[PDB]
Amino acid sequence: MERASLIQKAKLAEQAERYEDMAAFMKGAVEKGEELSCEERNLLSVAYKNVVGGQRAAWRVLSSIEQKSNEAGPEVREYREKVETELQGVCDTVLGLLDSHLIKEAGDAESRVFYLKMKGDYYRYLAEVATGDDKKRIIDSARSAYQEAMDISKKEMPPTNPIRLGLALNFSVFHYEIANSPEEAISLAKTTFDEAMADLHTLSEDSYKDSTLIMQLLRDNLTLWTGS
Amino acid sequence: ERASLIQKAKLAEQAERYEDMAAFMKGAVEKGEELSCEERNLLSVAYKNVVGGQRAAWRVLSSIEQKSNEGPEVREYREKVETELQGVCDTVLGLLDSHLIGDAESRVFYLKMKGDYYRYLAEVATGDDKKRIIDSARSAYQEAMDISKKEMPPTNPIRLGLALNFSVFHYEIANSPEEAISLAKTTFDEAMADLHTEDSYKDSTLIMQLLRDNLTLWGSLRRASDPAQ
């Protein structure tokens, strides 16, 4: 069998910063149809986060140029469309993996939340580029994925859990940027922060590291969305 | 069309999409037309980044492969990366040889680029082949050095860049650390001499700084006397 080899190669690709290869290896490993361990889920996420991150960054540059020139010819639109299409291909691939293999009405709650957060994240990336037609559905598919994830995490995981914090952080970004609900973004972020803060002495070192890093991102967004 | 491919290559540079940038520049070249100064740099920037990423990865994987057996996945994947890297170098050398040609200034530039890409093949070549590739890199650089020395000022950034890379070739590839250091100091001392002199100062000085860096890396600067502390 080559599942273990695909996973070993994905770890090598991570060290070599070959994220497209990392994503492909993890995709193939998922497709062997066995659940992923904690380590393996993170490899899947790291890989696609980086792949899509690069496409999004590029799309932003190109879209920004396209808009500021509309008072550099058809080339900007054509190339922005190429990048956009490619990006959608990645999100569709990731959502295809989540729906066909990973998300299940079964198993522990953390991994359930992890995949639904991932589902919200990738529908949110589709929403970043979508036009009014697709937009509404997509925004809503992102909202339900996050909301379902939020409901589980709130009942099953501590407020200091990094998957829970990460979920809240991203859902608040969704509110601010995508849904155009800056109030619930600010509110969710403050609430998340304060609830986690109250529970910090229950966390000992090592877990405190992971969680305070995400709490620092919440504080940063809050300061940005308001004042220092 | 050609002008569109060049416009798209500029956009790809801004979006940091170097594989796309390389492909657009390849297509623009393929259309014969000599490249302007700006266009040559776009070609170089694109492939420098593409191959840079493959080299960095190859470095990591080869390093793991060597430290480890002192596991077939490492070899297989290192081979995949290596093969892909060779494909890029072969593509670039194919462009240089196929659509090479005009003037002395630009002739240096392409021969330097020819030396650079044969040097990247040498970074991974095994034996019978490695030894030949090293010479194709050496002649490309040497021919370019001879032109630059007779036609360009010692402050010229293409000339400085060529010297810098040829000296790297000597230390790393040819295992001639003596001429690598000789060449690198000679190059920086000859440029330092005529520094005061349009105004491309900052352009040139950046490459001078790389020569001192790589020389300090190979004691540090000049002799040491008692440091007051």
Numbering used by the authors:
A (entry chain A): 1 to 71, 77 to 233
B (entry chain B): 2 to 71, 78 to 108, 112 to 207, 210 to 230, 234 to 244
What do the study authors state?
More specifically, 14-3-3 s bind protein partners that have phosphorylated serine and/or threonine residues presented in a specific molecular context.
PKA-dependent phosphorylation and subsequent interaction of the transcription factor Gli, a central player in Hedgehog signaling, and the steroidogenic acute regulatory protein StARD1 with 14-3-3 proteins have recently been reported, however, no accurate structural information on these complexes was available. For chimeric protein construction, we have chosen the main phospho-site of Gli for pCH2 and the first potential 14-3-3 binding motif of StARD1 (RRSS57LLGS) for pCH3. The pCH2 crystal structure was determined at 3.2 Å resolution. There is one 14-3-3 dimer per asymmetric unit; forming a closed cyclic structure with its symmetry mate where a single subunit of each dimer contributes its phosphopeptide to the binding site of the closest subunit of an adjacent dimer having its own binding site occupied by a sulfate ion (sulfate was present in crystallization condition). In the inter-dimer complex, the central Ser640 is bound by the same canonical residues of AG as in pCH1 and other 14-3-3/phosphopeptide complexes. Interestingly, this binding mode leaves the two opposite AGs unoccupied by the two remaining phosphopeptides which are unresolved in electron density maps. Instead, these ‘unbound’ AGs appear to be occupied by sulfate anions present in crystallization media at high concentration. The quality of electron density maps allowed unequivocal tracing of all linker residues of the Gli-derived phosphopeptide, except for the C-terminal alanine. Interestingly, two closely packed phosphopeptide-binding 14-3-3 subunits belonging to two different dimers, form Cys38-Cys38 disulfide bridge. However, this interaction is distant to AGs of each subunit and does not appear to interfere with 14-3-3/phosphopeptide interactions.
